[PDB]
């Protein structure tokens, strides 16, 4: 990370072997879940993209996945050049390289450079689009390994409808955001998925109604118990 | 978040994902439990709508419990449109609009116009009216699985009077329901199911005086098991 | 919680979660129990009225004594209200009010209103009126919700007198009785509620003889014990 | 606690739940025991008599040895009564009262009428001599409570010489005597009461000899010695 | 190690004992495997060879790997001093020394010397090229006690596509090979030994397509039990 | 310790409890064991005489070795004696006296006074010269509790040779021998308790020119190197 001096100076404090402890301990408990991707946002504040490659290289897992997120990477910046191409000519005194996009990803750049495009007029901001460009890799690791399909969930004998409507809700965020889709479930595949003494609560309720009444359904039908729950 | 705060300025500083890895672990150990609605308005003391966002993004379960929270936002967001017209601010601090509902959610908004507004005087506080709306969706989810709670609880002799009347009022504390009504359950409901040797007693003490007394009677009951009186 | 010494650096910062659930785990634990009380202001330290129900209320727990604890907090917010005639006559701004019961319970004072009074010249401190006021109210839930009682403590069948000493101690603690009752249970209480082969002893000593004198009499063998931990 | 970072300045930290759970954690386990004594007096550094007090009250176990130290800093407040007059001639604004036995022990005191005497030029010892009186005070319980009589102290029948004199030091640090009978007790007790082989090689080596000659005698008595396992 | 904050000169202080502690966890648990590159590189910015020496005397175990590690130092120590890079130099002759390979392992310099040169202008970085020597032998470490041969790598019997090309990145992540060496293996050797049925598709689909439409191939094909699991 | 050493490098801080624990962890179980020494040291940087105290006198386990650091101490505390005829005041009006081996060694000197020298213009650096003699003792430990015992160990039948050649050279690390001995203990004494299939690849290479080789090599005699504990 940047330690800023009051006139804007940019002295580079680097990483703790603690602080990468902590959060490689994240992700040998939660992988790279929705949990875990804000949690990173945070942890890449004032971040340098040496400091985001670093933090990214010091997990040993899913080297696959982390690959599928180099890839990202990659790509975005084989379209950064593409968008924003490199001057020719010898530079003058006093002026400073547009980075290309093997220079925004910290590859063949200096940190002084890094941290120097940081200080420009205007800035150009290298760790802050670095870290735009994670989030859209660690979404592609999500999309990838979710195991469950939404046609696919279903309420059996003993299952309750506040677990089983939750788990299908935490299905569709990590399906592709659409409204026409996420209207669909609650007319269809919530409803019909059900367990069958379920399925008349959710038939009668149906497809128009207010949702705090949608999402509260079934209690006391069709799981254990008396009143259709273990808690 | 805003810091160092009552100052007459304000400096923001980044959120710990420290901090963010103990907000998930109150909702992963007891999920939106009574006790976790202070906790949050604690800890979103001086936070900004972007700071919201990532407290709310980072919560991976209880997905059922944000569509219902999500309703609350973009019902009281559609409702000031209706209310207000979006106008420019004074020219001289640098304000060029009001918010809307959306900047408000972090949804059409910058982190320096929500600053922006909150530094000024007199101030427009984005954070605070956005706290006092998830606050309210948060009280939602309380009562969504549970509604007459104080009704559904088991009642006998089984357990002491004091083992009860410390779950009754975890009930009431759950319960939202006005006063009166939590003062006729507490002479009603609570002493109906109480030992006939102290049942004279409780029902002048009622909710209408102290609690400490209610403990000096029944005595000599025994723990948990099968009784009908009292020693 | 209000940062340093009062009148010194006038600044309020937000209560860190560590802070909040260190103290949750021992209300869990070790329950209502002597030892929790100067946790309580070792925890509380630097507080608001606002910080104090924050606290309060996180628990999750124990909720008969939580309204036993708010009566009496209602009982001495109520006796300030009849003692006090308390100003309200027209009041200059920059000088500040005089605080009634509610105000220092945190229910009726903005939060720039409560350090106002904790930074004034001299500084009021409402959080440490507070303060008082649940520790008052600990006491008597402390004897409560004991697990001995001192009209039933003696010396157990082969217990040293030196271990049953350091229980009517933990206990005396507990017991919420003045000091010269206090004072007269060891001179009369504890010799005559040890076991016969130690009163033949105690009586002939008398109360001249001093506490070690007697703890040295009556002990288990010398050296070392069986156990791990110390003797 | 006083904390000091820049020369000739003094200021005040307040004290952690986290210090007070490792305090109480190894009070637990271990008691008051000499490797507790300059761990405390670490702990206690900087510390004012309200968190000495904080220390003191947070413990809550070993009540018979906690009550034998409020005995003796008391029997101590009794003497600084007997050998310094009271205070009580009348004061003002920029004159400050001569600290009573009781100011000192922070049992009639606020923290600004305590950091106050502390942080003067030339500075009032108020901070250390309470610590004094608790060092003094647990060397007092571990008089008591140690449990070996080093008189009758002998060496195991198969025990090696090596941890023979590493017990010996080991029980004899808790022992009451001046340190002219400590040494005696190591010359007389250590030679005499080791197995009968081995306290003819410590009379032909001699009494008055150096620990290395004496620490390397005797191998193979009592069938062969040993060494620590990390190779 | 050598750092400034926002003061203007590079001093010299020691590492944080707290540290130490953090690095004892990536030994203990991530010594071979690649994990502990990124860890170490982190660690060992700011770095003199003194700093860097203290690092590896450190390490208490694995002294088989240590002295691979000593003996990869020492024949990187004489290709180095024969090929001699270009770097900074003294101004002037007999002013301060000009570094051999024993003088950058830190064994013939102080750090009085090491200071003097990392300081200078041009400054002359000794420990960073130490450094490089430890990343390549260290490199090497987790290559040589890795135990997955890439080349003999097999796609298991009722294994899928998936979770072997996880395994097949990890594997290429400890190898030391060439970055258009390693290419080519992902496009040559990880589908040659590929199981027949997957592999035939993998023909099919191209050996050089892109990984996120790659590792879904091969789905359910390899037998009953692969359809049933959806593998 | 000294603590802000870019501010000053004069004003102190009491050692840690929490670096207490750390040095406590080690002292019971590696105290004897060669990394012992490089962990102290980093420890202990910066340290006054008292500190260094401090940590000896906190440890409660291994007595003897307690008094072993004691024993070496004042035999180097008595040659500061015999090398320096030093003075009682200042030899120089306008400077400090000269310490001795008893102000050096923490027994007639106030933390002030240690202080006092390290701060003082040129410094005297007196935990400087105490530091080294605990280390000469930790070294005399290190031999005391736990010699080498190299010519013991040999390559059982079924055992590894990487595994055996790891003990050999942490064994070799243990040894303070002169080179030419240990130089013998890899040409001669390896080669002759290593297994007959391993003594071959032994006699060929050389082990004082490569140890890579013969990781690789030998993988029969204790199995397949894959299968191994150490993984």
Redesign the interface.
């Known amino acids: 990370p940047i330690?800023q001096?009051?006139q804007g100076q940019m002295?580079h404090q680097?990483?703790?072997?603690?602080t990468?402890?902590?959060w490689?301990k994240?992700v040998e408990e939660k992988a790279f879940?929705?949990?875990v991707?804000?949690?990173?946002?945070?942890?890449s504040?004032?971040a340098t993209p040496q400091d985001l490659n670093?933090m990214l290289?010091?997990?040993?897992g899913?080297?696959?996945?982390?690959?599928?997120l180099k890839?990202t990477i990659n790509e975005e910046a084989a379209e950064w050049d593409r968008l924003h191409p490199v001057h020719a000519g010898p530079i003058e005194p006093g002026q400073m390289r547009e980075p290309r996009g093997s220079d925004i990803a910290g590859t063949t750049s200096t940190l002084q450079e890094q941290i120097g495009w940081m200080t420009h007029n205007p800035p150009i901001p290298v760790g802050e689009i670095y870290k735009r460009w994670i989030i859209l890799g660690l979404n592609?690791i999500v999309r990838?390994y979710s195991?469950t399909s939404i046609l696919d969930i279903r309420q059996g004998p003993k299952e309750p409808f506040?677990d089983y409507?939750?788990r299908?809700?935490?299905t569709?965020?990590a399906e592709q955001a659409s409204q026409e889709v996420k209207n669909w479930m609650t007319e269809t595949l919530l409803v019909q998925n059900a367990n069958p003494d379920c399925k008349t609560i959710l038939k009668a309720l149906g497809p128009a109604a207010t949702?705090?009444e949608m999402?509260?359904a079934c209690?006391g039908v069709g799981g254990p118990g008396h009143?259709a729950r273990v808690l």
């Open positions: 330690v001096n009051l002295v680097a990483i703790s072997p603690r990468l402890n902590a490689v994240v879940s929705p949990e991707i804000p949690m990173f946002s945070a942890l504040e004032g670093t290289n010091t997990v040993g899913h080297q696959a996945a982390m690959q599928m890839e592609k990838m195991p506040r409507v939750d299908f809700y935490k569709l965020r949702l705090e999402m509260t209690q009143k």
